[PDB]
Amino acid sequence: ASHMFRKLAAESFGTFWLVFGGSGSAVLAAGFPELGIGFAGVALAFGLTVLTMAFAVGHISGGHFNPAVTIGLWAGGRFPAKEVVGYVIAQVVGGIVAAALLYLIASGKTGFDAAASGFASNGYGEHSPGGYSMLSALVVELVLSAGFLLVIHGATDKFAPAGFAPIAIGLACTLIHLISIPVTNTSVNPARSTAVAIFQGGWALEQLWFFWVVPIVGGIIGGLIYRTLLEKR
Template identity: 45%
Template sequence: MNKYVAEFIGTMILVFFGTGTAVVTSGLTAGIAGSFVGVMAIALAFGLTIVAGAYAIGHISGCHVNPAVSLGVFMAGRMDAKDFGGYVIAQIIGAFAGTGLLQFIVSSSNTLKGLGANGYGTASAVGLNMGGAFVVETFLTFVFVLVILGVTSSEKTSSIAGIVIGATLTMVHLIGIPLTGTSVNPARSLSPAVFLGGEALSQVWLFIVAPLVGAAIAAIVHRGWFSNDED
């Protein structure tokens, strides 16, 4: 149960700080320079939250805080089906708790709006279509999960895993934010979409399916070519 509680808390914090930074910066930045600052701030918010979470709850649950990560770990043979199901449920509930807290803050403001939902087409900052968004989310999640499986596969690198994973999440957000808002995490995408409804909810399927596909491919590649004796 401690593992599931840790995943709940970790995902709640990730969603609140990550999407919350997206909400706050969207109201404070304008123009090219402002957009750059916004992208950097959001990317760092997600990355630094993972670093903090890794050292706060990593020793309890591994700090997956992401159903796609849990799927990759499960397919890599590092967790059983029971824990996989428990992790995903805890992560989804935690995501809704984080978005619920953010919704309360947004509703208490006269200027803040949105909840950091992902999107494509008119909901994408660059007008990326559905096919492009699917490829982006699949590839970014593939890279993210492949790094996680690699850096946590050996005791030699596990001590720096939190920093490496946080830096990688920052990296994928730097390119992903203008394209789709960057999901790579079905729980992070589902909760804002449900709260907002409308277009965000109609598009959320992509940000659930594509990250899971990317994570599955990463697990297959890792087990097939990159695993070692300690893995």
């Protein structure tokens, strides 16, 4: 619970939980006829994966579960450069294992088609859920990634009352999904996008680069804003 391999295991398990729960709710439950959970149910699910695992393993690894979080916290002066790559690998691996099991579960229902349905992948333009342009996709992911990082930096500030951060951060995740699912299906998380794109297997992989660079640039901006403008004291 403090040697690096335990932190990496925590990060893998937490990103697994995020992908399995968030994407799983989208694939299995969102569009279920009459009773299905909708975009709002998916948004809640994503936020709860983050809230629950932040409480469960946050005291072990920091509970990032998201390459743009790790890199943003590096930019914000909160996390060492030398640990970044190990965390990103752990997150990507955890997420892919989750998408794999989800793919197996989803395949047990007649008619399931990962490629055709999109398998909860992030896309823009032709592949945005609401047909939003690439420019709309860029602006929304940049803003929401920066804000998510600003919220993470603030809620874990020296002077923020202790213990509440998993609630602030997890519900910031729900919020972000409530806003942006129609635009990009909501990434703000390169590991989540990657895990699911692998099984969609087509356009998701062709557009994947976008859901690495934009959330990471946004997260860096959020970390820099907090570090340079809000933190001092």
